[PDB]
Design a protein around this ligand. Sequence first.
Ligand SMILES: CCCCCC/C=C\CCCCCCCC(=O)O
Length: 260
Amino acid sequence: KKSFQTNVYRMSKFDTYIFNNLYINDYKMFWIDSGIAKLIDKNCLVSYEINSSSIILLKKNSIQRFSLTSLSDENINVSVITISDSFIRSLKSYILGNKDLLLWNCEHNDIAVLSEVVNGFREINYSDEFLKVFFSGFFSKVEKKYNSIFITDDLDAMEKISCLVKSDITRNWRWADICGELRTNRMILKKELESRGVKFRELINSIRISYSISLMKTGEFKIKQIAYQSGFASVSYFSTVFKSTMNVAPSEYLFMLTGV
Ligand SMILES: CCCCCC/C=C\CCCCCCCC(=O)O
């Protein structure tokens, strides 16, 4: 359970959630509990319908640009599972021998286990062993259904940059700071941002927004405090960037962390 952080979001009939420059702090996976939805991937310029068996995987350190639109006349619950790095590396272990958004059409076996994870393991209490072989076997499969490895040699350049920023979120980050800390020139590091279609400012802001989300999940409701705790120079800039990224206001998202 501590290796799994889950949330459930309500989706009104035919409503749309829009994400722009959304930085994925840790591996995530989500799916709808019922009905049908339309996912539009602005990064690959593609769209497709998903059902209660479709599982979407988001790669850590990726910068997402997509929208999800309900195509159901009833409310839909979107379950989101966040996996800890400690568990992910456990998965790397059970697996021996550039796509950031992976879609997997389940065989109501995997979506059954995933549904129990969001369900807080209160109907079935899988073991560490099973969960490790399951998930490891899950990514191992989806990796084949796509371009490259979903997991990453930990010392990836983007991972180094992200961890750096997260380790001192309020520092007034500049390219010079990144190059100096990583002992690497910008000509070599710039590919990480280019391939993700973001300029330096956007990258730092994206990491700070996801950091603010993590804070709101711990039980922090004071928006004013969250703005500064997340490294933003002001509450207004935080709110502007948050709204631009999540398409909703910070306080609005916090409210969604309640659940009905
Ligand atoms: C705008 C409110 C957020 C609604 C989130 C549910 C919709 C799609 C699932 C995508 C998950 C990425 C959102 C990040 C938030 C989180 O980490 O829980």
